[PDB]
Amino acid sequence: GEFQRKLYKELVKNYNPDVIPTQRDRPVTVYFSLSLLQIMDVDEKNQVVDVVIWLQMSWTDHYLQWNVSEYPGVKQVSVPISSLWKPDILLYNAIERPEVLTPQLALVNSSGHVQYLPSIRQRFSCDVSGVDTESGATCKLKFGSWTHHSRELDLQMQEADISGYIPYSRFELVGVTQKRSERFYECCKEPYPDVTFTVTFRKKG
Amino acid sequence: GEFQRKLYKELVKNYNPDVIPTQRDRPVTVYFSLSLLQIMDVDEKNQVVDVVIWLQMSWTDHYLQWNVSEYPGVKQVSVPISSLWKPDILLYNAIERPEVLTPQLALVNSSGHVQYLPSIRQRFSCDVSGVDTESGATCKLKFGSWTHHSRELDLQMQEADISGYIPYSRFELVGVTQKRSERFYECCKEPYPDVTFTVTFRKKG
Amino acid sequence: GEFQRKLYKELVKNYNPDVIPTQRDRPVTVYFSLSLLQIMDVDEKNQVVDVVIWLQMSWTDHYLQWNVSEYPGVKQVSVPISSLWKPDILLYNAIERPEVLTPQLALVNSSGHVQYLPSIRQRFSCDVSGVDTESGATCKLKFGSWTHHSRELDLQMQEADISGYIPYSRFELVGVTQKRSERFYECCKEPYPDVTFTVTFRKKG
Amino acid sequence: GEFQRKLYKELVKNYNPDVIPTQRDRPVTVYFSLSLLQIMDVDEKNQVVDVVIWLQMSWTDHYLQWNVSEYPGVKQVSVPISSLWKPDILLYNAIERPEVLTPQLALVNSSGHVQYLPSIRQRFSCDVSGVDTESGATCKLKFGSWTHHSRELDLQMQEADISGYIPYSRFELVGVTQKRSERFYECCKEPYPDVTFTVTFRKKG
Amino acid sequence: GEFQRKLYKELVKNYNPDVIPTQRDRPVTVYFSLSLLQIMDVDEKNQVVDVVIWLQMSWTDHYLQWNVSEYPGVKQVSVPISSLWKPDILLYNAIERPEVLTPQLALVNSSGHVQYLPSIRQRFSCDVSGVDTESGATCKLKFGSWTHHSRELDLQMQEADISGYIPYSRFELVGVTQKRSERFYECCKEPYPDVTFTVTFRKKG
Numbered sequence A, B, C, D, E: 001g002e003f004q005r006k007l008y009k010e011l012v013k014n015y016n017p018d019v020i021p022t023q024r025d026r027p028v029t030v031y032f033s034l035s036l037l038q039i040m041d042v043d044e045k046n047q048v049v050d051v052v053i054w055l056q057m058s059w060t061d062h063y064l065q066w067n068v069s070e071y072p073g074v075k076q077v078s079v080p081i082s083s084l085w086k087p088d089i090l091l092y093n094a095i096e097r098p099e100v101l102t103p104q105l106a107l108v109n110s111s112g113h114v115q116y117l118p119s120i121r122q123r124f125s126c127d128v129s130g131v132d133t134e135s136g137a138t139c140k141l142k143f144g145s146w147t148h149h150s151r152e153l154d155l156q157m158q159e160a161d162i163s164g165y166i167p168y169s170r171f172e173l174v175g176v177t178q179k180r181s182e183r184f185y186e187c188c189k190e191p192y193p194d195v196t197f198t199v200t201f202r203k204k205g
């Protein structure tokens, strides 16, 4: 519609997607969770697991809010993620780049809350030497911001999901746990948070 | 011609391809169908099917209409899809990104009706454990919009085609059925439609 | 030179590469031919042939002509194909995208005649059962425009070449024929032309 | 914040990322180090090693400094590396391009000191003929600027790290040493520095 | 420095990288040579050789010259090749696109002489049927401009080098010759030069 077209024009004006949208030394809170959809393969020689994981991220960007009565009918909009600031979140265990399977779009509502929910095909490093035993292999998937400390980007955790796991693969899911942490690194004065998912699985008999 | 060159210049003016062309809370109807052209391979270990499928989409964009007597001779135009809004339709079963085999162009007529008909090479997840039996393996291919609900994008179905199936592959087509659906999801207020194709096939001999 | 630099500046001015350069309801004639340079491989299980083919296309674009005495010395220019309109010609049998081996440049002379001669590495679908016999496998390579009918784009044929075929591959060339055709499709009012190359070949063992 | 947004706008103004930020017979000093995170594979037939290495680079760019009291609260910023000048450092032994695993971002503080710390997946040439012996295979990894001599770009060395080496691969790390050098080449009047890492490793069992 | 920043700004002004820098019907002379650095593999079934080759090209572009006393201290500059005109030189035997291993930068001195020295990973077609014999397989590598004839681009030859050949591969170098030539092709009125390298090699006992 015409109201949407006018809204998109205003949202991009004076907006720099390279600048994290903090406000007066108050961090941007980013909620992060993961749904393991499939274990595609396990390479026992090279110590590699191949997965499809659906990442779910959300945060508030105060530059993206609008008055609902100025734009009647427009409750939320669909925007390419390249036009917004997004978290620079990395899988620390990754040995190749991710392949993104979903359209690179985010949903933004009228108070500036953004949802970006990419599904990714990803290969990563793990010791899979007990994968073909009763107590299987257990792998850690550590996620965190690459360039923003706790006072800039407050990474927070949400409930993990196993309901979407594909039943017909040759691996079964024994368990999934999760834990937020915070550490000081040698480089830097400020601490950096992370969210780590621990996945235990094994080959089907 | 000169009239075409002037028309393209007007069509792009004040046009944002990121904004779905709804008008006064009336959704954009999108007709969707599929023609299975080939089954290239079946990976029985990893539970993957490799296909070429020809997707057929059409819809009306009211911003792309023109007066026929202002542009005499110009009944329709060939336009790169990147310059238009297009449906953000996703194959939910996909485990890699699609490879598009056709030129990325759409046809638009004078009342703003768009046709975009991409042929794609695609690999996806399915239980193929009865592929080498009499009754065969049966796979679901679920398609739907990633960011637009029913009141924005009204996805509608059309008749599937088996006539283009390649006769000389090592798999034969036992059947194809189709079904539109509509559900409420936990996330969201508004319902989401989808179009699902069920394909049954088996190995020859 | 200085005259060339001035000419390139004028050629791009008021030029839209998305608009086919028809003139007063007279189609653009496009001459098309093919030289088979190599048969790299044949996949008997999956019914795929791997080739290098040199495509040769030429046409007249009336917007690219210049007065020879305004630009003395300048008989023809070398221009990136991305800055011109080009035919949207497709190999209908293709199962992957082409890999272009040559620089993406075209030659344009002073009366606007364009030559664009890409060499491509291409895999396509064919029944190759019979490849290891005396009479060999016979494959059709069908080429045509994706979005332009006969009254917009008049596809014409030229003499096929076998002189560039590499003698040291493990496949030998039994024969090559070619045929222009024109058909009505279900979609459309206007007929669409094509040029099809029929290649018969066999294993040397 | 608002001060950050204003700062980014000023940093890009009159800034050319193609120009090395020397001033008047001072070179740009670039500190370089490496942390070997994993040996993924060794191809004994083709003489190739496959690694993940974390490169650590830092330098001062005097065009990126700002007055701290003009931008209160803003001590450092996160910037895409493509918008800055960066060292043109090359692995001389490389037989494919690198695959970058981390976000392409750098940290810049108020006096213009830049940190850029890419983790890369890289394959390179080495004689691995004693890899399955007690004393192991020993490989040289030579790094240096491609276009800048010593008086433009002063490459300096820092302490190598083995603490991040993954314990569960099928190769073990016998040792890592490092050495800065400087040589005259036939081409050029000015000498060129390099930093070379020598890595000795062997197969387990 | 400040003089460099001013120089880069002037060099790009009124510069079109698509226009070969001839001057009053006098061709651009391009010196071309090759250093074979490695033979990575030989595929005997498909008739393919896999190499790393270091190409060395240089030429004069009269638009890139500057007065040395206007820019004191600035003898040469490091510039991205994408901002300059470069030779459109092709390996005629290539069956895949090249992978460029070096930074895409060129050196330009004050009288406008450009040096561009890309190292490339390349696969090409050759009859390797005597590779495992005493006299070896002999392959021709033919290089030439794709769109410029002799009167536009004067391709000249320089001394080949085998000093960079890697000693630890499983193939050894029997012989290398080189030869400049000039031929008429069917397309065109004007003759086209080429530089061909003949490499004889064999498997090690």
Ligand SMILES: *[C@@H]1O[C@H](CO)[C@@H](O[C@@H]2O[C@H](CO)[C@@H](O[C@@H]3O[C@H](CO)[C@@H](O)[C@H](O[C@H]4O[C@H](CO)[C@@H](O)[C@H](O)[C@@H]4O)[C@@H]3O)[C@H](O)[C@H]2NC(C)=O)[C@H](O)[C@H]1NC(C)=O
Pocket: C109, C110, C111, C112, C113
């Ligand atoms: C740019 O390149 C193009 C492509 O090659 C080139 O187009 C060709 O131009 C020539 C004109 O010189 C065309 O040849 C003519 O074609 C028609 C028949 O189709 C004939 O009338 C001409 O024959 C002769 O007729 C006269 C008898 O009354 C004689 O006086 C004399 O012998 C004529 O030559 C002649 O064959 C040719 O058809 C086109 N081709 C295409 C595809 O358009 C163009 O000329 C080039 N431009 C420049 C400035 O170099």
Ligand SMILES: *[C@@H]1O[C@H](CO)[C@@H](O[C@@H]2O[C@H](CO)[C@@H](O)[C@H](O)[C@H]2NC(C)=O)[C@H](O)[C@H]1NC(C)=O
Pocket: A109, A110, A111, A112, A113
């Ligand atoms: C925009 O979306 C956000 C996030 O969904 C909404 O804020 C949440 O609203 C729920 C209502 O049950 C609260 O329980 C949460 O505390 C809110 N979340 C956060 C992170 O603050 C918000 O209401 C939406 N705004 C509008 C105007 O629709």
Ligand SMILES: *[C@@H]1O[C@H](CO)[C@@H](O[C@@H]2O[C@H](CO)[C@@H](O)[C@H](O)[C@H]2NC(C)=O)[C@H](O)[C@H]1NC(C)=O
Pocket: B109, B110, B111, B112, B113
């Ligand atoms: C533009 O294309 C549309 C879609 O083909 C045309 O509208 C259809 O015309 C058919 C056949 O005459 C009718 O039966 C349908 O009612 C129409 N379908 C839809 C989805 O609207 C339309 O006529 C074309 N416009 C012009 C100006 O020719």
Ligand SMILES: *[C@@H]1O[C@H](CO)[C@@H](O[C@@H]2O[C@H](CO)[C@@H](O)[C@H](O)[C@H]2NC(C)=O)[C@H](O)[C@H]1NC(C)=O
Pocket: D109, D110, D111, D112, D113
């Ligand atoms: C910007 O960062 C650089 C690098 O960390 C700082 O320079 C170093 O400061 C330490 C003290 O923390 C000194 O011991 C070193 O001598 C400095 N190193 C170099 C290479 O200069 C610099 O002080 C920082 N600037 C600000 C304003 O904080």
Ligand SMILES: *[C@@H]1O[C@H](CO)[C@@H](O[C@@H]2O[C@H](CO)[C@@H](O)[C@H](O)[C@H]2NC(C)=O)[C@H](O)[C@H]1NC(C)=O
Pocket: E109, E110, E111, E112, E113
């Ligand atoms: C820019 O570089 C070119 C090429 O290196 C220089 O010209 C060469 O100089 C050598 C050495 O004296 C001469 O023998 C040759 O006549 C030149 N070679 C070519 C291919 O032209 C040139 O002098 C340099 N310009 C400046 C100002 O230093």
Ligand SMILES: CN1[C@@H](CC(=O)c2ccccc2)CCC[C@H]1C[C@H](O)c1ccccc1
Pocket: A054, A105, A106, A107, A115, A116, A117, A119, B092, B145, B146, B147, B185, B187, B188, B192
């Ligand atoms: C959850 N998702 C909805 C979420 C949403 O609208 C959304 C939010 C944010 C950005 C983009 C889209 C929209 C579409 C329906 C549903 C999709 C299905 O659950 C799903 C999730 C993960 C993998 C495959 C399928």
Ligand SMILES: CN1[C@@H](CC(=O)c2ccccc2)CCC[C@H]1C[C@H](O)c1ccccc1
Pocket: A092, A145, A146, A147, A148, A185, A187, A192, D054, D105, D106, D107, D115, D116, D117, D119, D164
């Ligand atoms: C510290 N370092 C990471 C260190 C780590 O544990 C790590 C990284 C990669 C592989 C293995 C371990 C943790 C997060 C902070 C980061 C440093 C900062 O983000 C940074 C990024 C880019 C340029 C300069 C500085």
Ligand SMILES: CN1[C@@H](CC(=O)c2ccccc2)CCC[C@H]1C[C@H](O)c1ccccc1
Pocket: B054, B105, B106, B107, B115, B116, B117, B119, B164, C092, C145, C146, C147, C148, C185, C187, C188, C192
């Ligand atoms: C596609 N169709 C016509 C439809 C059209 O013009 C068109 C309309 C809209 C967008 C793009 C092309 C064009 C001419 C070719 C024909 C294609 C053939 O049916 C086909 C397509 C794909 C696989 C097998 C067969």
Ligand SMILES: CN1[C@@H](CC(=O)c2ccccc2)CCC[C@H]1C[C@H](O)c1ccccc1
Pocket: D092, D145, D146, D147, D185, D187, D188, D192, E054, E105, E106, E107, E115, E116, E117, E119
């Ligand atoms: C060429 N290069 C110099 C840079 C330079 O002169 C140059 C670079 C690019 C363009 C013009 C000139 C720096 C010193 C090393 C030298 C070449 C090295 O031995 C090399 C090693 C392995 C593969 C390729 C090249």
Ligand SMILES: CN1[C@@H](CC(=O)c2ccccc2)CCC[C@H]1C[C@H](O)c1ccccc1
Pocket: C054, C105, C106, C107, C115, C116, C117, C119, C164, E092, E145, E146, E147, E185, E187, E188, E192
């Ligand atoms: C290309 N053609 C000439 C150039 C030209 O007229 C031309 C080039 C590009 C566009 C338009 C015209 C000279 C350059 C090579 C020659 C063709 C060679 O036999 C060839 C051999 C093998 C595969 C492909 C091509």
